[PDB]
């Protein structure tokens, strides 16, 4: 048996004491105020006295919502410490008018505020009437903050210390609270919700919390935009300074669903095809034979610009879509000029030929865009491309093409043939680096699948992919340094002359492969082509008859096989399976903000001409406060109805007809 | 048939990556190109039991990294007779990169985007198939192309 | 003591979840019908 | 602009009968009465008219839970029909007890009765009531009947008679009409689960209802069972006979659900482990080391059966769990034995050896066992097992394994090196014959994978693939066929003679593959062979310059390579996903039942001895009847309270409200 | 439910103790032998009063 008894004792209500607090409970007015005024005279009954749950008579009343008893309660004065905080929780108008106009324990941490806590449930009633006194909120410190008083709370009491950081930033992050109480609640949203993210980054603990009020953050400033009711609404909010000056401030923030609204997707549409009033409602092939001609008179447009930019061909050019079909159709020719420019090879450094000659102005015209760009964009929006990594890297490549081409012109004169040429002769390294800037050229096409409808999704998706692959490659590049350190241990003594294989030939591009493992570096690429099935078996034999160490080197590359091919690739098979499951349902979002991210930047007047031709306040801050100021009514208005649109509801219910009874009964 | 339209949404990506890998490959190996008398058995290209001029012009490269996707492309293959070992070794980095590529990224993705597509469109199979079917038995109601070929005629 | 307050604050954070059926229902419509039952009979 | 009227107009209620009717709504008895009495004096307001809705002041009164009204409504003498069908859908019993007592449109269809509909609604109050009278539930006839009044409804109206049979069945497979009026309710739903299955496999069209509905009847069964609180009740339970009579009859019936569970399973559990009272609670070593004890005395415990079946250790074999290791360690010594049988090969048709003298008597055991099976069981019962079948195909190829060395011995007696014997030579066949039948013989051990926890679901899951690897095996082989028909159309006019090869080697299995694709058997092997990469690509090439005709198959291989491949494969992939994880939620329960077709089939007396040792009533119904009692009481409660614990709750209480409302003011 | 537990603890109230997980005794294996399925279900309705 066990015995079960009250490790932690109270103090035990008295009979009285538990038959008053049973008549607040069903709401009896009149047995209660029978016991509140015997209680002066006789005092027999406690008014404060708790009850097994720790809720006193006060409580109790404000649970059931009975305005009444809460009142007669009041009127006898007794304790009303924390009372406000469980009126506000319990989001009950009469209970905070009633009890606004007059160490135990408690539900509430000792941080909270009634405007913290009435902030928290986001409840407009509540929050207006206690923002209509004069109540402040305290101001967080930096996120990265050092002064004196932000490092001795966290070292005095570190738990209290982020508990009331978490609390202050979630009675900030409230929708109402901030539809009130908030000169623009559209930038005040954006950088909340900015800043609540780089809490949630720094800190490691209650990422969760951060996240999800900075999400709240977001769907608010969207839901703001969407309360928008007219197309002057949209345009006066867009581009509002504190054109499109608000909506570039929200891409900067990061404001997928703000930049992906219908409205403003229509809006950015409109303004993406100036030239076309009608593109909206075409063929495909009426589409496709536009784009075709566009494209294919893109020099035209690039003259025509540069002669008289004020003409119906000169500013032609200007509009967005245009100005992208011309950009592409630009870089189509290039790539067509890259295919061509491999249709004598004995001269060593030659002069360039036709087709190099049509190549350069346009290798030039990239480089000078990309510095342009660097010189007025800036450092860190350069950078935040992260596209402009690929062209840098062929820009770089492209450079030392060139200065190889020169070197190997004037340092060499004579036609030798290239069997005998040295292995690190100019013009091979230059043609070595040209190609790989050919296959960098071609490849930066992948950033043009944004501008499609069915490209861009799929693109954002197998981006979004890319990192669980970054993920995987570590442990895979762990596994096979493991490997190649063991396979070259082992097979290093038996490394063999160019000589002595059967055609002079070494390592492993050879007919018969041989030295797989004699060196770490050719260890290395030989565990790298056995991924794809390459490596031949004989690899794991050596020429003297050591069969344990041919039968140990076969095992360590067969395990090798095994979890590179087996464990490692359906693990990353998995993993791709997983992220793109999570994010197919965010793909449209993302698309969207990309795909305004590739019309903005052609809305700019910087940038026009593609390469090779680049190189040849008051009365506006009045009327956004008065669009703000309808869509803060039309947002209420639409969330309190969406909220109206519990146990506690069925309990108030009962505490009303009991109510109703006792005072029929005594009536009668 | 409804995950067909995946393969080809990837069909598009796949295809821009082969050219461009195309592109390179032929840049850099064009220079070698041998005539079919010096081969071995009078044979050029990698349908040969020695393969060779894998590279050497746009189409046969385009083949040759289409083959390497089911390994029927050998190593070797990225070898010249001249000793130019930096030439040699950046050809069959191409190489690797494509293979890297087009198996272990792009093909990975694929079935990823297959298993979506399919855990999506099998709640609706059993409509589908019911309305497929209905136009397959209504286009044997007509008096029209009773008798099959050859009666017909 | 410690003990005592995380136990008091667990009791009350669960309670206040759990109030956060058809037998409810019928709860309402047996009290109404009992406040109906005493009105008549004292009319 | 676009009118809208009536289309379809109606007979509009005058300006009384609309205040009547809401009178009637809102529950004002006193209204409503004077109304009633007026009508019958000055015949001003029709009783039976209906609202917008089509519902009459009856429908009204029955909707809102209103007896008053209803009762008053009763003794005005107004139109009854289908009101019943209303007030036992609405599940309210007052309704149906007063009414009970005492071709418009309908939202019943012309088949539904009140037993019917009562059924439907699976209301165990409303159901007893109904069945308290002398009702009674037309009998379905058979899923295959071809009588003349099937075939006549059928013909006349097919949409009618196959509603009319849904809604029959519905209303049997009633848990509550199933509690009630049924001799056995286990029994009952055994084979009502049954027979829907079967309509479900018939009816191609409401497949899904019935699939429901036996699922329904299954539930029931198992939730019986759940009601069980004691051994002995089980035990009775499992053990009636219309041992383990009643568990057999589920497993016929494949009640899944019925089998798996927990009390039946540890029931089952006790009977298993007969020898060893606590095997429950041992560690895997104990367990082990007992298993590898037994197993290695398998011969002994055999030979002790053989001559005293009567002693400790006799009968130590009869015991289920011994008797099942028994067997397996026999096979396991057969298979050691096979393995063996590989340790002069110029004899033609040599005597059998020592390894074949100890092998043949496992092999007419095993035959033996079969026959014996087949004799004892039954004909059904052998061909439902389906592992039955590899059994066969291996009894056979040992049996041809047998005939040939036979004829290998008795037609050749000279010794001649297998280098010039025939292709077709009897020892060869027999060899071929022999290493197919230790291929399936090894691989019969899948079936014992059924008695492991951690091995059994997996078993499940991988044969319940199978049979998605089954429907895209018939897609493949398409392919397959197709394109093997255009690479011979194109590629036979090429054939080569085994000459001219370089080897004398003709085919693809040759050093230097060729002949690929010249005859259509040679190119469906090629075909075969290139899923796995081990087809090289010169064979796409002739000795011809035709290089178009190279080109051409060169294209069709990669074709098929593509689609097999890339296309095919993946999709495979895809819908192995899907199905594994639609299945992973049932694979607990279907291992469960599998597991007890395996305990059981060691519960019989026959059989006992493994190979190649094997060649050498009305108490009991009336206690079943008072079990079925108490579970059927035990599970009407238990289902009323889990449905205890809609808007037209609320509307009951508003209805409520207003009546007493009503009534409070007219006596005030 | 914390109202009605308290009330019942209120008073002098036991719950009988689960023997070992693995235990051998003779009380154990008699109420096994002879009714495992109550066995069973009151070591089970034990452990969910005590968790
Ligand atoms: C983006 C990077 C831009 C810059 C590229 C790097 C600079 C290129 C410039 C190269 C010019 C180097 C001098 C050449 C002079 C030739 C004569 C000579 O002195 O040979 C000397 C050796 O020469 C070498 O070792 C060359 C090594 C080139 C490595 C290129 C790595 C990057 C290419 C892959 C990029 C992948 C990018 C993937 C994305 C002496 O040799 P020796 O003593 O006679 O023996
Ligand atoms: C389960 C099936 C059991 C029965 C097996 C079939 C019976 C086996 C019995 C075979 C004995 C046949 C007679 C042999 C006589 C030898 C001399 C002779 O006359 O050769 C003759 C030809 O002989 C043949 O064509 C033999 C063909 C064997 C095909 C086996 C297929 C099944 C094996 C795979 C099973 C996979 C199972 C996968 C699961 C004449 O040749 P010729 O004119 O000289 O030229
Ligand atoms: C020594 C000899 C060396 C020879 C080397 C030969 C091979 C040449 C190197 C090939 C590098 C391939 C880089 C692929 C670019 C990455 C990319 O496209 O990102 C897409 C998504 O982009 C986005 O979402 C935006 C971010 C873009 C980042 C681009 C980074 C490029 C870095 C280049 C270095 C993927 O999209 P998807 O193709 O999966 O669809
Ligand atoms: C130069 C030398 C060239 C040599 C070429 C040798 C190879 C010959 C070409 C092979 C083409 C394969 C076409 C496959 C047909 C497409 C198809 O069956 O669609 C099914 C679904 O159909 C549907 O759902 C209805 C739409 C049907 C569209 C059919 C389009 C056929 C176009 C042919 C061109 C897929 O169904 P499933 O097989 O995945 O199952
Ligand atoms: C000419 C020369 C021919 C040479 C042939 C050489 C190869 C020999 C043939 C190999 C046949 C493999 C049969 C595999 C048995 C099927 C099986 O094990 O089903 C398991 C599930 O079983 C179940 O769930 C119960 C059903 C069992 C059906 C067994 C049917 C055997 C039919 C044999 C014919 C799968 O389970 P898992 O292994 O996926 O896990
Ligand atoms: C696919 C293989 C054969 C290589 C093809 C090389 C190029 C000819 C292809 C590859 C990617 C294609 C581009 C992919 C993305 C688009 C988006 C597209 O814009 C639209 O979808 C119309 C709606 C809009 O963007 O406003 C314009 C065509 C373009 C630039 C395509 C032009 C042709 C490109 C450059
Ligand atoms: C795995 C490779 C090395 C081939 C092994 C051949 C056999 C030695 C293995 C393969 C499958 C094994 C069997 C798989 C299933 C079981 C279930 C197992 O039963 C239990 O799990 C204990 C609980 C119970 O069954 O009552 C008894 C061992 C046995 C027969 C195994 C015995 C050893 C087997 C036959
Ligand atoms: C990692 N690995 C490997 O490198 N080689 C290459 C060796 C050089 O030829 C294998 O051949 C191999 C393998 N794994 C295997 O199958 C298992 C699966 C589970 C456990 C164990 Cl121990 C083995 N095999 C097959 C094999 C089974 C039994 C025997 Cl006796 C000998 C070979
Ligand atoms: C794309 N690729 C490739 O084309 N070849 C063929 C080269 C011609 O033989 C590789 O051999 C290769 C590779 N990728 C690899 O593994 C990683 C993984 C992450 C980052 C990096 Cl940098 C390398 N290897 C193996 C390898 C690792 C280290 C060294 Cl020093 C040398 C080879
Ligand atoms: C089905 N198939 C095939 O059988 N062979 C073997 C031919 C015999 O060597 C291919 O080489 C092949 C291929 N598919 C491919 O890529 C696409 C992808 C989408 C559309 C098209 Cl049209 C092609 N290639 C590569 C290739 C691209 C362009 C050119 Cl010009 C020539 C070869
Ligand atoms: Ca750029
Ligand atoms: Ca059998
Ligand atoms: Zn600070
Ligand atoms: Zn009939
Ligand atoms: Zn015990």
Same mark, same amino acid.
């Given at each position: 048996?066990?015995?079960?008894? &009250?490790?932690?004792?109270?103090?035990?209500?008295?009979?009285?004491? /538990?038959?008053?607090?049973?008549?607040?409970?069903?709401?009896?007015?009149?047995?209660?105020?029978?016991? +509140?005024?015997?209680?002066?005279?006789?005092?027999?009954?406690?008014?404060?006295?708790?009850?097994?749950?720790?809720?006193?008579?006060?409580?109790?009343?404000?649970?059931?919502?009975?305005?009444?008893?809460?009142?007669? +309660?009041?009127?006898?004065?007794?304790?009303?410490?924390?009372?406000?905080?469980?009126?506000?929780?319990?989001?009950?108008?009469?209970?905070?008018?009633?009890?606004?106009?007059?160490?135990?324990?408690?539900?509430?941490?000792?941080?909270?505020?009634?405007?913290?806590?009435?902030?928290?449930?986001?409840?407009?009633?509540?929050?207006?009437?206690?923002?209509?006194?004069?109540?402040?909120?305290?101001?967080?410190?930096?996120? !990265?903050?050092?002064?004196?008083?932000?490092?001795?709370?966290?070292?005095?009491?570190?738990?209290?210390?982020?508990?009331?950081?978490?609390?202050?930033?979630?009675?900030?992050?409230?929708?109402?609270?901030?539809?009130?109480?908030?000169?623009?609640?559209? +930038?005040?949203?954006?950088?909340? %919700?900015?800043?609540?993210?780089?809490?949630?980054?720094?800190?490691?603990?209650?990422?969760?919390?951060?996240?999800?009020?900075?999400?709240?953050?977001?769907?608010?400033?969207?839901?703001?935009?969407?309360?928008? !009711?007219?197309?002057?609404?949209?345009?006066?909010?867009?581009?509002?300074?504190?054109?499109?000056?608000?909506?570039?401030?929200?891409?900067?923030?990061?404001?997928?669903?703000?930049?992906?609204?219908?409205?403003?997707?229509?809006?950015?549409?409109?303004?993406?095809?100036?030239?076309?009033?009608?593109?909206?409602?075409?063929?495909?092939?009426?589409?496709?034979?536009?784009?075709?001609?566009?494209?294919?008179?893109?020099?035209?447009?690039?003259?025509?610009?540069?002669?008289?930019?004020?003409?119906?061909?000169?500013?032609?050019?200007?509009?967005?879509?245009?100005? =992208?079909?011309?950009?592409?159709?630009?870089?189509?020719?290039?790539?067509?000029?890259?295919?061509?420019?491999?249709?004598?090879?004995?001269?060593?450094?030659?002069?360039?030929?036709?087709?190099?000659?049509?190549?350069?102005?346009?290798?030039?015209?990239?480089?000078? %865009?990309?510095?342009?760009?660097?010189?007025?964009?800036?450092?860190?929006?350069?950078?935040?491309?992260?596209?402009?990594?690929?062209?840098?890297?062929?820009?770089?490549?492209?450079?030392?093409?060139?200065?190889?081409?020169?070197?190997?012109?004037? /340092?060499?004169?004579?036609?030798?043939?290239?069997?005998?040429?040295?292995?690190?002769?100019?013009?091979?390294?230059?043609?070595?680096? =040209?190609?790989?800037?050919?296959?960098?050229?071609?490849?930066?096409?992948?950033?043009?699948?944004?501008?499609?409808?069915?490209?861009?999704?799929?693109?954002?998706?197998? %981006?979004?992919?890319?990192?669980?692959?970054?993920?995987?490659?570590?442990?895979?590049?762990?596994?096979?340094?493991?490997?190649?350190? %063991?396979?070259?241990?082992?097979? =290093?003594?038996?490394?063999?002359?160019?000589?002595?294989?059967?055609?002079?030939?070494?390592?492993?591009?050879?007919? /018969?492969?041989?030295?797989?493992?004699?060196?770490?570096?050719?260890?290395?690429?030989?565990?790298?082509?056995?991924?794809?099935?390459?490596?031949?078996?004989?690899?794991?034999?050596?020429?003297?008859?050591?069969?344990?160490?041919?039968?140990?080197?076969?095992?360590?590359?067969?395990?090798?096989?095994?979890?590179?091919?087996?464990?490692?690739?359906?693990?990353?098979?998995?993993?791709?399976?997983?992220?793109?499951? +999570? &994010?197919?349902?965010?793909?449209?979002?993302?698309?969207?903000?990309?795909?305004?991210?590739?019309?903005?930047?052609?809305?700019?007047?910087?940038?026009?001409?593609?390469?090779?031709?680049?190189?040849?306040?008051?009365?506006?801050?009045?009327?956004?406060?008065?669009?703000? !100021?309808?869509?803060?009514?039309?947002?209420?208005?639409?969330?309190?109805?969406?909220?109206?649109?519990?146990?506690?509801? =069925? /309990?108030?219910?009962?505490?009303?007809?009991?109510?109703?009874?006792?005072?029929?009964?005594?009536?009668?």
């Amino acid at each position: 048996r066990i015995p079960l008894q &009250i490790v932690r004792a109270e103090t035990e209500l008295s009979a009285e004491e /538990k038959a008053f607090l049973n008549a607040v409970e069903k709401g009896d007015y009149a047995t209660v105020k029978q016991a +509140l005024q015997e209680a002066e005279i006789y005092y027999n009954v406690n008014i404060n006295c708790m009850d097994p749950l720790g809720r006193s008579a006060l409580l109790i009343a404000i649970e059931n919502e009975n305005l009444e008893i809460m009142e007669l +309660l009041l009127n006898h004065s007794v304790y009303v410490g924390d009372a406000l905080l469980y009126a506000i929780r319990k989001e009950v108008v009469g209970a905070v008018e009633l009890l606004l106009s007059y160490t135990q324990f408690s539900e509430f941490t000792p941080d909270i505020t009634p405007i913290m806590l009435a902030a928290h449930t986001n409840n407009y009633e509540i929050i207006k009437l206690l923002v209509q006194k004069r109540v402040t909120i305290p101001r967080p410190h930096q996120i !990265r903050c050092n002064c004196v008083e932000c490092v001795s709370s966290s070292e005095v009491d570190s738990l209290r210390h982020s508990r009331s950081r978490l609390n202050i930033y979630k009675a900030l992050a409230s929708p109402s609270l901030i539809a009130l109480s908030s000169e623009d609640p559209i +930038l005040t949203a954006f950088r909340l %919700g900015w800043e609540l993210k780089e809490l949630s980054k720094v800190e490691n603990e209650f990422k969760a919390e951060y996240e999800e009020l900075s999400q709240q953050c977001k769907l608010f400033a969207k839901d703001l935009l969407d309360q928008a !009711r007219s197309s002057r609404e949209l345009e006066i909010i867009l581009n509002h300074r504190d054109d499109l000056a608000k909506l570039k401030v929200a891409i900067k923030y990061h404001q997928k669903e703000f930049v992906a609204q219908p409205n403003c997707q229509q809006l950015l549409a409109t303004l993406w095809y100036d030239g076309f009033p009608g593109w909206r409602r075409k063929h495909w092939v009426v589409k496709l034979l536009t784009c075709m001609t566009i494209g294919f008179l893109f020099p035209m447009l690039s003259i025509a610009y540069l002669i008289s930019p004020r003409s119906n061909l000169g500013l032609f050019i200007k509009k967005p879509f245009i100005k =992208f079909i011309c950009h592409t159709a630009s870089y189509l020719t290039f790539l067509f000029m890259l295919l061509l420019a491999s249709q004598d090879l004995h001269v060593q450094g030659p002069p360039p030929t036709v087709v190099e000659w049509m190549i350069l102005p346009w290798v030039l015209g990239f480089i000078w %865009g990309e510095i342009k760009e660097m010189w007025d964009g800036g450092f860190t929006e350069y950078i935040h491309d992260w596209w402009n990594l690929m062209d840098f890297a062929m820009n770089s490549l492209y450079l030392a093409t060139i200065s190889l081409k020169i070197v190997a012109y004037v /340092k060499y004169n004579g036609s030798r043939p290239r069997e005998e040429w040295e292995m690190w002769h100019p013009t091979l390294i230059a043609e070595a680096l =040209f190609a790989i800037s050919n296959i960098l050229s071609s490849l930066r096409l992948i950033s043009l699948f944004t501008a499609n409808s069915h490209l861009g999704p799929l693109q954002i998706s197998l %981006g979004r992919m890319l990192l669980d692959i970054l993920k995987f490659l570590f442990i895979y590049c762990l596994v096979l340094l493991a490997f190649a350190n %063991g396979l070259n241990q082992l097979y =290093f003594y038996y490394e063999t002359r160019a000589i002595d294989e059967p055609n002079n030939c070494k390592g492993i591009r050879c007919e /018969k492969q041989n030295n797989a493992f004699s060196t770490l570096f050719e260890t290395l690429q030989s565990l790298f082509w056995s991924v794809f099935g390459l490596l031949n078996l004989y690899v794991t034999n050596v020429k003297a008859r050591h069969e344990f160490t041919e039968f140990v080197g076969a095992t360590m590359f067969g395990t090798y096989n095994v979890i590179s091919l087996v464990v490692l690739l359906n693990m990353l098979i998995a993993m791709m399976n997983n992220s793109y499951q +999570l &994010i197919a349902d965010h793909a449209d979002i993302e698309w969207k903000f990309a795909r305004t991210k590739l019309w903005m930047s052609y809305f700019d007047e910087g940038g026009t001409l593609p390469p090779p031709f680049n190189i040849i306040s008051l009365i506006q801050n009045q009327h956004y406060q008065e669009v703000i !100021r309808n869509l803060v009514k039309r947002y209420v208005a639409a969330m309190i109805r969406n909220s109206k649109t519990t146990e506690e509801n =069925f /309990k108030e219910l009962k505490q009303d007809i009991s109510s109703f009874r006792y005072e029929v009964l005594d009536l009668l």
